[PDB]
C-alpha cells in the first residue's frame, strides 16, 4: 500500500475525521485533523500522491467555508498551492480570501502583493493592483507596511521619479502609526535636491511662485536662493507634520492603546469588556471624522475580534441606515450578520423591519418560511419566546395583508386567523413548560369590538375556564386580562359591562385562589370600579 | 399620468437620443413571486413588445432572473416600470389585472444590478456593501413612474459599460444562489447552537473558572464603588 | 543619538473632567418638580445605574452609571432635553463624598485634591457593557450571549434567555398601571 | 505557518538549507540562549484567553527627535502609570 | 417613550396591513411605522432629516472637553494615487495650528454646584 492508504487505514484518521464531523464549529478539531494530514505527507513535492493532495485541498477549503475570517489559513492554502507549482490557483485562493473580507484586510493585501510582485511581470497591471489595494486598506492605522511595499516597487521600477513624490505626498497626510518614517524620507529627499528645477518635482510651478515666493526660472546666483527655498519647504512640511502628529497621538492615546486583539480567533472565544467598550467608542470617533473609506475599514477591522457577537453588525447597519441613508446596504450587512453571530434574535428583528421598510414582502415571506421550517413547522413549541413572538408579529402583518378581514368595520383579524390562532392556542395549552403566556393573552385581549370580543371571549377565556387549567385560573393576570377585554368593548354600555364583570366573571374564580388573584384584581378594581371595591373585598374574605 | 405608454412616448419625445442603444449593456434584475402563473402571463405580454434577444428570463429551480442585454435607454424604462409595478401591484391592488397601467398610490421600489466595470461620469442610488462579488447593486426608491421614467433616462444617459464576458450571467446566478444558500444554512443552524454542533462539554470546563473570577471582580467592584461613594 | 524617539507628555492634573474612569453625570437645571424616581425613569435605559440622587432644593441631580460608555451615551442622548419644562445641562460631576471633601477643602482653601474613581479590574469576559437586566439558569456561556450583568437596585446575576420575556412582561405593567396613576415615572 | 518563516511552504526548505555547515560549535556553546523554535503543529487550544497578563501594550508611535518640541504639552486624560 | 414605541410596534404589526402601511409612508419625512420606532428607540431627540464647527466634531474623542483640532484644509487622502498622478499636487492649506495646546472645559459642576 501507498502512503495514502497507510493514512486512510490509520486509527487516528478515523477519530480526527469523526470528531470534526461531530463538532463542526469548534476548530481545534479542524486544526488537529488538518495538521495530521499535512504531516503524514513527509515531503510535499510535485510527485506526492494525487489522492493525498486532493484530500488536503478538500480539508483546507471546507475549513475556509466554516470559518471564513481566518486570514492566516488563506495565506497558507495559497502558499501550499504555490509550492505545488500552479500560481493560478494561488491567485484564486488569495482573491477568494480577499472576497471573504469585502476587500478590506491588511494582512491579505500585504501578502497578496508580496506574492504578486514575483509573478505578475507586467508593470501597469502590477501597479494597478497597488492602486486597488490602496483604496480599500490604505487608511488603516497600521498600513505603513503597505506603503513601504508600494514605495519600494516605485523606486525600483520607475525611471522618472515623479511617481515617488506623488505617492509620498499623499502618505504625508495619512495618520499612520509609523507616520514619522515617511516624514523622514521626505526630509532626506528634500535635503538631497541639488537645483531649482527639482522643486517642480515637489508641487507645481505656480504654487511655488504664488504661495511660497520661489521662482524656478530665477536666473542669477542660484546657491543661496536654493537654500532659502529649502528652508521654506522644510517649514511647510513642519506644519503638516504638526497636524498629523496631533491626529496620530490622539488616536493612539485614547483608542489604539486599548485594543489588544486584532484578529479573528474562533467562534468560541470571548472578548474582554474593555475591548468591547473601546471598539464602540472608536467606531463613534471614526463615524464623526466622516471619511467613508475609513469608516468601512474600521467596521471591517472591528468585526475581526467580535464577528460572533452582533453589536457591531447592528451598529454598522445603523450607520448605513441613518448616517449614509442606505437601506439595501443595511440589509446586506444584517443579512451577512446572520451568518456570523450566535445570538441572531436582535438581528432578525431589525432585519424584518428593514425589509418591511424596503417594500420587499416576498423576501419576508421566505424568511418566515425558513424560520418555521427550521423548527420543523413547529415554531409554537420553541423554548426561547423571542423567536416565536417576532415571527408571529411579522407573519400576522403578512397575513392581514394577504387575506381580507372576516369581521366588521374592516377590523383586520390579527391573531384570530385559523392558521395563526392554532399556533397561539397550541402554545397556550402547555401552561407552564412554555415561557410567554401572559404576553400572549395580553395581546389577544386587544380587539375592542363586539364581534371580535365575542370570539376572543369564547375561544380562549371560556375554554380555559371549562378545561380547568389550574395555571391560568390561579393566575391573576388571566382574570385581569378577561375583565379588561370586556370593559374596553366599545359595544357594551356601562351597566352592561359592570353587570357582566361583577355578576358573571367574579363568582367563577375559586376562593382557594384568592390569595393569588386578589393583588391583581384589586388593581383592576381601584383603577376602574371604586364603587364595587367593597363587593370584591366581601367576596373573597 | 400613470400610463406607461403615455410616459414612454413622452420620453421618446424629449430625451435627446433616447432611441440609441448603449454598447455592451447588461442589467440583471432578480425577482421573486409567489404565483408563477400570473408572472408568466406578464412575461408573455412583455415579450410581445420587448423582443426575445433584448430581454430574457431564467428561472432558478420562486426566483426569476430578468436580464436585459443591449437595451436602448428607452427600452430599460419600459421593462423596469412594468416589472416593478407588477411586483408591487400583487400586494397593493390585486384586483385590477392590467399590466400596462400602474394604479394610483404605487411607488416603485426595487433594486437592479449592473456589472462592476461601469463608469458613471437622486432617486437611483448605488449601495455601499454589495453582497454579490463582481456586480454593483443599485436601489430605486419612491418613484411615482413619471419620476422613475425620467430618472432612468438621466441615469442610463450617463453610464457607460465595458466588455463583459459571454457567460457573465451564469456567474451572477451561481453567486446569488451561493449567498442565499449561505443565509438559509445560517437559519437552519439557529436551534443547533448549543451542543448540536459545538462541543459544549469541553467548552464549559474551559470557561467556567474565567466567568467565576470575572464574577468575583464584578462583586468586588460593586463594594469598592460603594466605599468610594458613601460618606458614612 | 537616533532620529526617532518615543513621545513624552505631561499629566493633566486629575479633576473630574480628566478622569477617564468617571461614570457619574451632573444634571443641572432641574425643575424642582421632578423626583428621584422620575429622573431615574429618564436615565434608566442608557445603562445600569449604581445610584440616582437629587440635592434638596439645589436644582441639580447626579446619576452614577456603572460604565463610562453608558454615561457618555447619557450625555449625548439627553442634552438640553426639557425635563419638566426646563432645559437640562449635562456634564461630568463627582460623587457625594467627593463633593463633601471638595466643599470642606473649599472653606479652608487648602489643597482641593481629587482622587480617581475605581475601575472594574480588567479583563472581564462575561460582561457586555451598557446592557441592562430587570429581574434556575444553565448557561453555556457561548460568546454572543450575555453571561453576566449587574442586578438593578446590588448584586451580580447571570442573564438568561428568559429575561427578554420579563422586561416585556414588566413593560406591559407600567403601560397599564402607570396609565391610571400608580407610578408617574 | 505564515509568520514563523521556517514553516512557510515557499521558503521553508530554503531556510533549512541556508543555515551553515556549522563546523565550529564552540560559537554555539558560547551563545547560551535557548533557541525556542515554534512548531507547525500548534492549535488554538493553547492560549485560550490571550489577555490573561500574557500581552503588553502596543508601543507608542515614534516621532522625529528634531521636532520633539512640536508635541502638545499635556495629554487630555489623566492616565495612571 | 421606550414603552410607547415597543407596544405601538406590536400593535401596528398585529392590527394593520401592507396597504395602510405603504400609504402611511411619505419620503419627505422618512417616517415609517415599522422601522422608525426601531431607529428612535433610545434617541429622544431623533429626527431623520462645515461639519467641524459642530460640537460633535469638537469633542469627538473626549466628551465634555472641547478642543479645536488642527486639520489640513485641502486634504487628499480621499483621492486615489492614480488620479493624483494626473496633475501636480497643491500645497496644503491649514486650520487651527494655534489652538493645539488650548483646550476648554465648560465646568458646570464647579460653578453651579460648589460655588453655588
From Swiss-Prot, chain A:
Function in brief: Essential component of the U1 snRNP particle, which recognizes and binds the 5'-splice site of pre-mRNA. Together with other non-snRNP factors, U1 snRNP forms the spliceosomal commitment complex, that targets pre-mRNA to the splicing pathway. U1 snRNP is cotranscriptionally recruited to intron-containing genes. Required for U1 snRNP biogenesis.
Motif interval(s): Nuclear localization signal: 230-235
Official protein name in the record: U1 small nuclear ribonucleoprotein component PRP42
Membrane is among the record's keywords: no
Species this protein is from: Saccharomyces cerevisiae (strain ATCC 204508 / S288c)
Molecular function as annotated in GO: RNA binding
The entry's keywords: mRNA processing, mRNA splicing, Nucleus, Repeat, Ribonucleoprotein, RNA-binding, Spliceosome
Nucleus found in the keyword field: yes
Miscellaneous: Present with 1730 molecules/cell in log phase SD medium.
Record localization: Nucleus
Gene this protein is translated from: PRP42
GO biological process, one term: mRNA 5'-splice site recognition
InterPro entries named among the record's database cross-references: HAT, TPR-like_helical_dom_sf
A Pfam family the protein falls into: HAT_PRP39_C
Quaternary structure, from the entry: Component of the 18S U1 snRNP particle, a subcomplex of the spliceosome.
One Gene Ontology term, aspect cellular component: spliceosomal complex
Curated annotation (Swiss-Prot), chain B:
Subcellular location: Nucleus
Function statement: Component of the U1 snRNP particle, which recognizes and binds the 5'-splice site of pre-mRNA. Together with other non-snRNP factors, U1 snRNP forms the spliceosomal commitment complex, that targets pre-mRNA to the splicing pathway.
General remark: Present with 361 molecules/cell in log phase SD medium.
Subunit structure: Component of the 18S U1 snRNP particle, a subcomplex of the spliceosome. Interacts with the nuclear cap-binding complex CBC1-CBC2 (yCBC). Directly contacts intronic sequences of substrate pre-RNA.
Protein name, as recorded: 56 kDa U1 small nuclear ribonucleoprotein component
Organism: Saccharomyces cerevisiae (strain ATCC 204508 / S288c)
Part of the whole protein covered: 44 to 295 of 492
Curated annotation (Swiss-Prot), chain D:
Coiled coil: none
Signal peptide: none
Region (Disordered): 21-61
Cell compartment(s), UniProt: Nucleus
Source organism, top-level taxon: Eukaryota
Family stated for the protein in its record: Belongs to the U1 small nuclear ribonucleoprotein C family.
Role played: Component of the spliceosomal U1 snRNP, which is essential for recognition of the pre-mRNA 5' splice-site and the subsequent assembly of the spliceosome. YHC1/U1-C is directly involved in initial 5' splice-site recognition for both constitutive and regulated alternative splicing. The interaction with the 5' splice-site seems to precede base-pairing between the pre-mRNA and the U1 snRNA. Stimulates commitment or early (E) complex formation by stabilizing the base pairing of the 5' end of the U1 snRNA and the 5' splice-site region.
Misc remark: Present with 2140 molecules/cell in log phase SD medium.
Subunit structure as annotated in this protein's UniProt entry: U1 snRNP is composed of the 7 core Sm proteins SMB1, SMD1, SMD2, SMD3, SME1, SMX3 and SMX2 (Sm proteins B, D1, D2, D3, E, F and G, respectively) that assemble in a heptameric protein ring on the Sm site of the small nuclear RNA to form the core snRNP, and at least 10 U1 snRNP-specific proteins SNP1/U1-70K, MUD1/U1-A, YHC1/U1-C, LUC7, NAM8, PRP39, PRP40, PRP42, SNU56 and SNU71. YHC1/U1-C interacts with U1 snRNA and the 5' splice-site region of the pre-mRNA.
Protein name: U1 small nuclear ribonucleoprotein C
Residue range from the parent sequence: 117 to 197 of 231
Curated annotation (Swiss-Prot), chain E:
UniProt-annotated location(s): Nucleus
Comment field (misc): Present with 4460 molecules/cell in log phase SD medium.
Family: Belongs to the PRP39 family.
Taxonomic lineage: Eukaryota, Fungi, Dikarya, Ascomycota, Saccharomycotina
Organism in which the protein naturally occurs: Saccharomyces cerevisiae (strain ATCC 204508 / S288c)
Function: Function prior to stable branch point recognition by the U1 snRNP particle to facilitate or stabilize the U1 snRNP/5'-splice site interaction. Has a direct role in the assembly or function of a catalytically active spliceosome.
Residues of the full protein shown: 505 to 627 of 629
Name of this chain's protein: Pre-mRNA-processing factor 39
Gene behind the chain: PRP39
